[PDB]
């Protein structure tokens, strides 16, 4: 079965943001306008028995400083009075300013996507769905002590931990516009949880990372991939702006299949951040919805056909509405290819809440009309080898080979 995070409390807190607004709302309503909750298993958020419960499983990778200072920050920002200059200090050295500002539901906001999160992955673990959605997580720059990006806690590391605690392998597939830092970050030093993260990168461009390592020598330039046991265990493709569904799903195809078949992992955890959409602000890549194809659903559909227990994520995406008809066919293709039952969504936005909302032409499609690779292919591959070697990890170099 496929299972959903959704609740009231829930539905409210993920809507209490200023910069996401709405959208969770939008998404969860689509799905449902398209008639396909009855097929998903409900998966409440997860709730603690005491604040030092809560604070327990927050800090298994925030430090205790960080949590406090975003729970204070939540104090301040239900209070009358200007923060103090002291308090601002505080603020600033965890980065709780800039794009991470404080609001009056930041830590509820916040914790809300970890209880998602959570809940999805035990619900994995014991087996009672096959894959699980949460549309409400998938915030993958926050840092142990450091907020990111609008990330200010991050679930998916939470998530993650709880699945290797459950030998576990898991693998980490994020398709967010962003390098996943975060959670690479959180994993650099681990075998068990291998990262791997398909993004644009150029200089200036936020984080900065996920790409060559630039160093004071005349030397190439070479691609950090983890360290200590961890070393070749954390893998990244940048791409140049510009690409489409099929370059983008040809680049990043064969890794998936060889990571897979490498790693044979546990549970794949994958990150759907929908900010690489022709019609999304930044105007970075050319991806669509397209479902006749669409790179997110190509990369969905190949990693669902492993038949791996899987979480998926939200993540980015500031065009609520385009956001909302991605998920919805990621919803819908989803329940498809495990449930092997047909899906037929009407090619027009059914009327609904946020009907409105889905102008001018009001359809399901998104408005729109549609050697470096070799590089990195021949790097990844060699990378993979590395980190199957160093792990002493059994397969088929010429199988694997051949993909690319
Ligand atoms: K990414
Ligand atoms: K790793
Ligand atoms: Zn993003």
């Not at 940048?238 to 195809?253: C, F, H, M, R, V």
């Not at 509405?321 to 449930?339: G, M, N």
């Given at each position: ?222 691609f ?13 493709l ?16 064969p890794i998936?299949?060889s ?112 050697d470096s690779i070799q590089k990195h292919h021949r790097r990844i591959l060699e990378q993979l080898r ?15 080979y051949?993909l690319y």
């Open positions: 079965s496929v299972g959903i995070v959704y609740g009231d409390q829930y539905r409210q807190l993920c809507c209490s943001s200023p910069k996401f607004g709405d959208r969770y709302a939008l998404v969860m309503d689509l799905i449902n306008a398209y008639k396909l909750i009855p097929e998903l298993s409900r998966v409440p958020p997860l709730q603690w028995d005491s604040p030092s419960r809560m604070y327990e499983a927050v800090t298994a990778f925030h430090s205790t400083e960080y949590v406090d200072a975003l729970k204070k920050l939540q104090m301040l920002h239900c209070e009358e009075k200007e923060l103090t200059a002291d308090d601002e200090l505080l603020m600033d050295s965890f980065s709780l300013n800039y794009d991470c500002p404080g609001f009056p539901s930041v830590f509820d906001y916040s914790l809300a996507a970890v209880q998602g999160s959570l809940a999805a992955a035990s619900a994995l673990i014991c087996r009672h769905c096959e894959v699980v959605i949460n549309w409400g997580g998938g915030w993958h720059h926050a840092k142990r002590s450091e907020a990111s990006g609008f990330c200010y806690l991050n679930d998916i590391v939470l998530a993650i931990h709880r699945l290797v605690s459950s030998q576990t392998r898991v693998l980490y597939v994020d398709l967010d516009l962003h390098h996943g830092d975060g959670v690479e970050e959180a994993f650099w030093y681990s075998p068990r949880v291998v990262t791997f993260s398909v993004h644009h990168a150029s200089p200036g461009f936020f984080p900065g990372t996920g790409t060559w390592n630039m160093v004071d020598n005349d030397k190439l330039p070479i950090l991939n983890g360290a200590g046991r961890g070393r070749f265990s954390a893998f990244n940048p791409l140049e702006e510009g690409i489409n569904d099929l370059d983008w799903s040809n680049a990043i195809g998936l299949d990571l897979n078949i490498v790693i044979q992992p546990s549970y794949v955890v994958v990150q759907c951040g929908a900010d690489c959409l022709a019609t999304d602000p930044h105007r970075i890549f050319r991806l669509t919805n397209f479902y006749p194809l669409s790179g997110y659903l190509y990369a969905i559909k190949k990693i669902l056909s492993w038949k791996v227990p899987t979480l998926i994520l939200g993540g980015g995406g500031y065009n609520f509405p385009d956001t909302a008809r991605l998920w919805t066919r990621v919803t819908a293709l989803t329940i498809e290819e495990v449930k092997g039952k047909k899906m037929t969504i009407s090619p027009e936005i059914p009327e609904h809440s946020y009907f409105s909302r889905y102008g001018p032409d009001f359809e399901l499609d998104i408005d729109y009309f549609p590395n980190y199957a070697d160093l792990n002493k990890l059994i397969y088929d170099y010429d199988q694997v051949q």
